[PDB]
């Protein structure tokens, strides 16, 4: 089964201002591993067009998906709920889902912060390319169960080192996996 944003979402993400981005996220359950595929298109606001000559300190930003005990996406997530659902064709089923615990990042594999620092294994790094250009790398750092105010979380951090000048922030796609809660 597949839980996703659909493959051609309208703006569904809010980073710096309402609906400034399109997060494409597809989660396919392969038993105890989730096979995940992600990309980002920023459509407006601070992160839309990167110019590090004019703004040298814009180098990193973060998108959080926060879930309750039923695996339902919380309102204060950067990702919006309306088009986050189980798939039907190239869209979603009409009714909002009530349960998706089998898609949640495993809390024993990836515990919440505690007196223990989270191990690095709770993170996956990938390198993506802005505008599909081989000389425009950026890094997607995905962390499982980092966040407060939720039962489960997936956090996507986007960062880069190069001094980009008028580069539109729209990325290639990256596949990863993680251990499912059940």
């Amino acid at each position: 089964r597949t839980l996703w944003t659909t493959p051609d979402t309208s703006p569904n993400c809010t980073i710096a201002q309402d609906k400034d981005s399109k997060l494409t996220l597809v989660l396919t359950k392969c038993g105890s591993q989730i096979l995940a595929n992600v990309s980002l298109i920023v459509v407006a606001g601070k992160y839309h067009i990167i110019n590090n000559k004019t703004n040298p300190k814009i180098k990193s930003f973060t998108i959080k998906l926060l879930f309750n005990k039923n695996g339902v996406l919380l309102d204060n997530s950067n990702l919006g709920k309306a088009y986050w659902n189980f798939r039907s064709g190239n869209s979603n089923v009409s009714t909002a889902y009530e349960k998706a615990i089998g898609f949640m990042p495993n809390l024993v594999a990836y515990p919440k912060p505690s007196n223990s620092k989270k191990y690095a294994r709770d993170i996956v790094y990938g390198t993506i390319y802005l505008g599909g250009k081989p000389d425009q790398p950026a890094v997607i750092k995905t962390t499982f169960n980092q966040e407060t105010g939720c039962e489960y979380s997936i956090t996507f951090n986007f960062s880069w080192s190069k001094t980009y000048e008028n580069v539109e922030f729209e990325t290639t796609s990256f596949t990863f996996s993680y251990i499912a809660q059940e």
Binding site: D8, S10, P11, Q17, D18, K19, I41, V43, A44, A82, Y83, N85, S88, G89, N90, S91, N92, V93, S94, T95, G131, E168, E170
Partner: protein, 120 residues
């Protein structure tokens, strides 16, 4: 299934006038999800990805997008949810020439329309 009238359309208007860009849609019984409307433009720079123009989402209008159209684009219907996602574009400039896309979604229903706008 969800469909839009005249899914490919040519429209010509004169400079300085207001273009009416129709996006009239028909829902099917299965389309019981949340209504979502997105308009996009393909920039004249063919190396630039499409840009968002205006949205209707969660019964609210979001229009802080494509700078060249800011303030000039509005939904025309007083009852958009009943099947009318049309927009107008005021004070047309020659630079407004291009292909505009209307995307209408009401999960699981999906449809798209492209308009080739010519300004004379």
């Amino acid at each position: 299934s969800l469909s839009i009238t005249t899914p490919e359309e040519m429209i010509e208007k004169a400079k300085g006038e207001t273009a009416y860009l129709p996006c009239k849609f028909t829902l099917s019984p299965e389309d019981q999800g949340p209504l979502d409307i997105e308009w996009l433009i393909s920039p004249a720079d063919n190396q630039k990805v499409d840009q968002v123009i205006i949205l209707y989402s969660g019964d609210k209008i979001y229009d802080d997008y494509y700078p060249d159209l800011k303030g000039r684009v509005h939904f025309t219907s007083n009852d958009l949810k009943s099947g009318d996602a049309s927009i107008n574009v005021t004070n047309l400039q020659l630079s407004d020439i291009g292909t505009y896309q209307c995307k209408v979604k009401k999960a699981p229903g999906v449809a798209n329309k492209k308009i080739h706008l010519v300004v004379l």
